[PDB]
Structure formats: C-alpha cells, structure tokens
Design a protein around this ligand. Structure first.
Ligand SMILES: Nc1ncnc2c1ncn2[C@@H]1O[C@H](COP(=O)(O)OP(=O)(O)O)[C@@H](O)[C@H]1O
Ligand SMILES: [Ca+2]
Ligand SMILES: [Ca+2]
Length: 431
C-alpha cells in the first residue's frame, strides 16, 4: 500500500514501541486500520519480528503462524501447574532466541491460559525471570468481539485459576502490563450517529430514542426475501448453509476443487474446498486486490463461468474477471542471524464464496452496505452489538423481528476493563 494515511493515533503507537520495554494493545473497530497498520509496524521496525495468531485462518491472513505451532502448545486448557513437554528443535530455540518483538493478531481470540503458556515457554528458552523472557509484545484486535465460547470442560479446569475468559485476564499481566491505543478513524466511511449508537449499546447507555430506532429496523417483507442486495447475517452455520444452498439450486451447477500443494493445515484453509456456483449466484470476494479493484468482503453477482475465470458484476457496478488465487502457508527461519519467512505449502482456489448469507463468525472483521439481522432469540452478552456492527450505516440494517431492550445484554468484564485503563494512563497491568 502506497497511499496509506499516518494518523496521530498510529504515530502514538510507534512512539510507544520505541521504548522496547513497552508492550502495546492496539484496538479499534472493524475498518479502523488494524491489519494495515500491523503491516506498516512490521516494515517500520528495526527489530526481528514474528507475527502469530490463535487460528490458522487468521495466521494466514496476517502472514504469520499459529500460536500453537510457534510455541508447541498442546491443544486444551493448561493450568500453571500442568507440566509442559518443553521439547523444541535446536532451530526453533535459535529462532525464538533471535525474536525481539512478538506480535499477536486477534488477541481477543486468545484464551488467557495460552498467553501464560507462552510466557512460560519463553522464560524456559531464555532462562530468565522476566515476563515473556524479555521479548516485547504487541497485540492487535477488537476488544469487543467475543472469543470462542468456553467449552464446559475448559470452564471447570480454568476457573480455579482465572477470574475471566478474556485475554487480559492472563496471570502474566500481574507481572507485566501494556499501553492501550484505540484506532478511531474508520477509513471506509465516517458515520457519527451510527457509531454513537454502537458505542451506547456496548456501554449499556441506550437512550429511549435509540431504542426507538432499533424498533424501526424491523421489516418482515425485506427480511424474508433473498433476491435483494441484503446479506443475511446469522449466528448458526446450519442456517447459512441452508440459505446459500437453497438459493444456489441444482440446475447448471459449476464446481471448482481446491488445489493443495505441500504442507497446508486443514483448519488454516480460508476458502471453499468445493466452490459450487452458477450464473446469477450471489458471492463475496475473499481477498484484497487494489489494482484489480476488489477487497475482502466485496459483494457481487456471477455473470459468466469458464474453466479458469469467473466473471462477476460487483455491487458497485464494475465487472471483474476473477482468477484462481494462491494462499501461502509460511513459517519462520533464520537467514544468517535474521528472521525471514519460507513457504512450506499453499492452496489454490477462486477467492469467492456464496454470500446470500454469512455467519456472525465468518463475518468477523467485515462490514456490508445492507444486512438482514436474524435476531438470535437466545441471549449471551454482546450478541446484538456484534450483529449491528456488521453494517456500515444505520439505514442499511433490517431485522427479522422487533429489537427490544432485553436483547441488549452487556458484557461488564469489558466495560470495566475499558473504564479502568482509560483512567489509569491508558495502561493495564503492572508498571
Ligand atoms: N492507513 C490507512 N490509510 C488509508 N486507508 C486505510 C488505512 N488503513 C486502512 N485503510 C482502508 O480501510 C480498509 C480496511 O482497513 P483494515 O486495515 O482492514 O482495518 P481493520 O483490520 O481494522 O478492519 C481498506 O479499504 C483500506 O484501504
Ligand atoms: Ca483486520
Ligand atoms: Ca526486553
């Protein structure tokens, strides 16, 4: 990227990371430039960086590696007194010993014990008492997107040792801490009234006027149809697959298989395994290409299907000839005494997926012009905030049922964290 804007908030982060004793939590809503600024921070860093993330898909998109493979972490809850098989290769040890700056993306998807397992592993390899073995730690993510639901079993094992199931509850943050910088510029568009409604909801300050706006979002006619430009945002996987497949149909179906090359983790695959399409299918772009003119999350309609090209007319009116795309699975090594990346696998497939409907989970980090919210009549803190936040404006939202005050379920663990650091020098943990 070459026309990137350097905001005062981004420079504040760069100012902070100069002092290599400073850890930093970089946060902000979808569209506030976290992924782009991450890349900038990489390039403009005089330090051997490693980028890691808690899922393969997020690792791949950030150009990094999973936390579990980087540090050899067993899958499952781990107390501070569960003993680790600290078996690392001589190369992994040498690599970790050259890491000066660890960057964790999607920090809010990191279950807290994993940070502590990481702190322990680094202390063992550095033979030090300093948290994370003295390595500087930068963390990127939206504080207000919930992590994976805690499985009934992890719940029981871990509650004896932790106060909460958010990343800042890691025990290491009694021994170290971090500055917080929220990115507040939304580059795609700037919408005060909508942004203020989202914030009022997440802070449980909804005014009676705002409660009335939510009521007017209901529209049975629009929300029960599938031929408009609205995308159905639903919580459950089954509902989205039902809607997408129902609309796809069985007549004149074209199939495109994923091509795997060398070593690629199944759960890191960010595309369809068997992309099935037809002329007129509603689809979403999965990757960004500024020169070709599409971005991750752009919606369009298939108009032509050939062997190696899928022609799509996007919502903005442009026709685009999509070709297959190759995601690279990389890992870090040492070239001399410098950390570099090396490809160990790839997968190849058209970067499009059916998009009459998308899950709340698959749409993490995306915004759309027009959404139909399916009210999750269950409950759980923060659901309605997440669903509303999938839109770019207030006027673009439609609901399948009336939105009532009781559907606003606040997450007080998060409100307390925000208000506590905002009044403690934008810093959390030990000084
Ligand atoms: N520094 C920047 N200057 C100009 N545009 C930006 C900048 N950062 C992000 N954008 C724009 O915002 C959109 C995506 O932002 P992104 O980096 O994905 O933010 P996030 O990860 O917070 O969702 C793109 O349209 C991109 O061009
Ligand atoms: Ca992002
Ligand atoms: Ca240090």
């Amino acid at each position: 990227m070459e026309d990137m804007i350097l905001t005062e908030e981004m420079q504040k982060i760069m100012n902070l990371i100069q002092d290599d004793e400073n850890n930093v939590f970089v946060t902000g809503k979808a569209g506030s430039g976290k992924t782009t600024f991450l890349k900038y921070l990489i390039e403009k860093s005089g330090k051997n960086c490693i980028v890691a993330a808690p899922t393969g898909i997020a690792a791949i998109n950030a150009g990094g590696v999973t936390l579990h493979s980087l540090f050899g972490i067993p899958f499952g809850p781990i107390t501070p007194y569960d003993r680790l098989e600290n078996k690392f290769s001589e190369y992994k040890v040498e690599l970790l010993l050259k890491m000066e700056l660890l960057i964790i993306d999607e920090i809010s998807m990191v279950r807290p014990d994993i940070l502590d397992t990481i702190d322990r592993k680094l202390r063992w390899v550095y033979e030090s008492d300093e948290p994370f073995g003295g390595v500087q730690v930068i963390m990127f993510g939206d504080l207000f997107q919930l992590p994976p639901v805690t499985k009934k079993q992890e719940r029981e094992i871990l509650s004896d040792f932790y106060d909460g199931f958010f990343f800042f509850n890691a025990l290491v943050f009694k021994r170290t801490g971090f500055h917080i910088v929220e990115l507040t510029k939304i580059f795609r568009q700037t919408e005060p009234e909508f942004i203020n409604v989202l914030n009022n909801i997440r802070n449980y300050q909804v005014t009676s006027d705002e409660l009335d706006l939510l009521s007017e979002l209901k529209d049975r006619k629009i929300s029960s149809s599938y031929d408009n430009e609205y995308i159905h945002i639903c919580t459950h996987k089954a509902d989205v697959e039902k809607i997408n497949a129902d609309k796809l149909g069985e007549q004149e179906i074209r199939n495109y298989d994923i091509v795997i090359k060398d070593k690629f983790p199944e759960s890191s695959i960010p595309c369809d395994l068997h992309l099935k399409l037809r002329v007129g299918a509603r689809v979403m772009s999965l990757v960004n290409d500024s020169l070709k003119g599409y971005y991750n999350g752009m919606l369009g309609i298939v108009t032509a299907l050939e062997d190696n090209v899928i022609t799509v007319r996007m919502d903005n009116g442009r026709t685009i000839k999509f070709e297959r795309y190759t995601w690279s699975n990389t890992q870090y090594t040492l070239k001399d005494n410098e950390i570099v990346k090396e490809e160990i696998g790839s997968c190849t497939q058209f970067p499009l997926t059916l998009a009459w409907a998308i899950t709340i989970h698959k749409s993490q980090g995306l915004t759309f012009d027009k959404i139909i919210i399916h009210v999750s009549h269950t409950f759980c803190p923060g659901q309605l905030y997440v669903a509303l936040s999938r839109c770019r404006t207030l006027e673009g939202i439609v609901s399948d049922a009336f939105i009532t005050k009781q559907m606003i379920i606040p997450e007080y663990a998060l409100i307390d964290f925000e208000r506590a650091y905002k009044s403690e020098g934008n810093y959390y943990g030990k000084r």
